[PDB]
């Protein structure tokens, strides 16, 4: 599903090539939800610095995973103005990776703390988007879902599709049933296995 559907415009990946992800099972995978403008797609990608890269989310320069974005001028774009989306552009320090800040404080520009209502030298860090379809390329919403790959000290449970071939009878083949390799022919048997075991 990730490879096809050519409206998914972003296809370059940093850590591992996407066509080789069928093997090498990991512990668990993650999914996110990023709604950004056209210029902010490249800033999310590692190795680039932008207004969304240092004040909203700092992705590591090398990590196992990547992003895929698609044009959403017909889904996330409304003619009445899409005002729900918010982002932080006022951060005092730098950003560590892999955390969220849901602070609802005020940002000051002077040395003294401003506080209270907004105005001059006292700004809210959360600023609202607007995603009407009449705008050009660079402001259209591109939904970004980043995937996480990790190899923590647990047995792997997230995998890909498994390759199953046809059944060949009375012929000398090389069976690989559930990872058990061997050589011989396969015949119908009268044996009565219990359902609690797979090998004889």
């Amino acid at each position, epitope marked *: 599903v990730l490879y096809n559907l050519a409206p998914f415009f972003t296809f370059k990946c940093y850590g591992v090539s996407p066509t080789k992800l069928n093997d090498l099972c990991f512990t668990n995978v993650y999914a996110d939800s990023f709604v950004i403008r056209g*210029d902010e797609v490249r800033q999310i990608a590692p190795g680039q*610095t*932008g*207004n969304i890269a240092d004040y909203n989310y700092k992705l590591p320069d090398d990590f196992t995973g990547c992003v895929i974005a698609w044009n959403s001028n017909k889904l996330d774009s409304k003619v009445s*103005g899409n*005002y729900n989306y918010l982002y932080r*552009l006022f951060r005092k320090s730098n950003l560590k990776p892999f955390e969220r800040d849901i602070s609802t404080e005020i940002y000051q*520009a*002077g040395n003294k703390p401003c506080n209270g*209502v*907004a*105005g*001059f*030298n006292c*700004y*809210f860090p959360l*600023r*609202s988007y*607007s995603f009407r379809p009449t705008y050009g390329v660079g402001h259209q919403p591109y939904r970004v879902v980043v995937l996480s790959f990790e190899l923590l000290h647990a047995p792997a449970t997230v995998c890909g599709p498994k390759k199953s071939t046809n059944l060949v009878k009375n012929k000398c083949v090389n069976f690989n049933f559930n990872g058990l390799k061997g050589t011989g022919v396969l015949t119908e048997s009268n044996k009565k296995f219990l359902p609690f075991q797979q090998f004889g």
Partner: antibody
Amino acid sequence: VQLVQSGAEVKKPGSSVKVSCKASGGTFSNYALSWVRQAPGQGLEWMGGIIPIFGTTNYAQKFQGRVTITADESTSTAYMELSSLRSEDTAVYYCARLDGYSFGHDRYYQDGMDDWGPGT
Amino acid sequence: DIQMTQSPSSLSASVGDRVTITCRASQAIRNDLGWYQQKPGKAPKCLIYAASSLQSGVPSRFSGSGSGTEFTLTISSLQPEDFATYFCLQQNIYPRTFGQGTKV
């Protein structure tokens, strides 16, 4: 949106000069109308930014109280009064829609400045 | 307010040269820097809203670079139609600094 400045006044000192910028189109607020002095012989400096809905009076150095910038209820025209006319303060006043926080429709932080006074 | 400097006014070059119009700063800010233009006797305009952001309504000759204490404007192909005076915007109070761009 387009900003149109009013005419000049008498050059002689002992009086207060009054200027006004009319913002035709785009009845919007919380974008501070920044006033700046332009001259071929001197540099530019911030004189002040007026907000219609808030009306804060944050100013720069060396002219605190010599200048008063006010406006109407929403957008419209912005008035600026300067007292104690002198010889080194002569320039042209430019009002600009500077980017910043908006508490109105909440659509663009960077709307795009395309408005300038004719120059009086 | 705290003072800062800008590029000298003696930047003369022919058609198709790179200019190094430098704005020196004192505080670590990114979006608050800007480059504006003022033609002598004509209508003013902007050049860049920040180092990493441009404007709609400019040719691609005007470019910005740098993110430290200096910010550099560069023209890819210099033309006589770019005869204007360029000024730099910093900080919250906006102390602006002198500037003069003429090719001679």
